């Protein structure tokens, strides 16, 4: 197993941990803030995924400082993860194209 494939796997594991802890911490941060909707675990997990993917429908979002901080860690974990898979795919295409030119 090559470095870029293990990093991708690692990144996917890590992002899943971030998604989970983000659900837990987002609820812990937003309860206590009147009007907040990000306050039960299942839908927080959905919110963390749609945040990590940068979709952002708008059905659920944090309104507190610490919930926004948690939000940012999720987004950056998401963008870095999905970017690292792209970097990994590129190393694969590039090695296969060195081979196919006899380098």
């Amino acid at each position, epitope marked *: 197993s090559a470095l870029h494939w293990r990093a991708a796997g690692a990144a996917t594991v890590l992002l899943v941990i971030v998604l989970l802890a983000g659900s837990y911490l987002a609820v*812990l941060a937003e*309860r*206590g*803030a*009147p009007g907040a*909707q990000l*306050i039960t675990y299942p839908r927080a997990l959905w919110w963390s995924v749609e945040t990590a993917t940068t979709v952002g429908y708008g059905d659920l979002y944090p309104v507190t400082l610490w919930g926004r901080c948690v939000a940012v860690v999720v987004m950056v974990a998401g963008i870095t993860s999905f970017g690292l898979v792209t970097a990994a795919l590129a190393t694969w295409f590039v090695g296969r194209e060195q081979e196919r030119r006899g380098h």
Partner: antibody
Amino acid sequence: QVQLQQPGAELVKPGASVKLSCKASGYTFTSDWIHWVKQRPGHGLEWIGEIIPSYGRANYNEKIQKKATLTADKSSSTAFMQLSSLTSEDSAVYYCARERGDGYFAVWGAGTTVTVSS
Amino acid sequence: DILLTQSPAILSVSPGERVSFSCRASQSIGTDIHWYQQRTNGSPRLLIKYASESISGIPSRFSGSGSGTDFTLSINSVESEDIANYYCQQSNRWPFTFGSGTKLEI
């Protein structure tokens, strides 16, 4: 099984304080919230506050005079509610309830009847 | 905070008839409403969760419907064990709030 065990009664002199307890059994998860609900005789249900015992954070009903302080003891699976400086407005039945973090009170304690009198 | 209105306060029905309790929320709460029953000298009991989902141990007699702001708890064929106060409660926005109660009366 009985999943929440509360004492039946507490007499409290006006101005004094008292610490209600609520021992939980059954399944206990890190995600568990314990809620406290005040009901005055012939009135309805009034949400007082909530605590997450695995972390110790508590949030309170803003709309009513803060009479409560919530704590938990992770070792004994017991949640406490400290009601301080009571008047006859504070005489009521106080339930605790367990909420798995998904929004509803699946199980309730039998309630503790608090009487403020001399 | 979300205000839950339960009107009427008392509901008179004849045995075997079908009865319906209304819960109106002051703004849209999707389906995040739950129903409790409290008999004289009892503690509340979850009857229905998330507007319509069944709880195990609750007679099939009870059902729920509704979304958004208007919600209904129904009893197909009332009987005397159903005499009690019925409360709704939302979990869509912090803090959780309770309806004011409807007494069933036969």
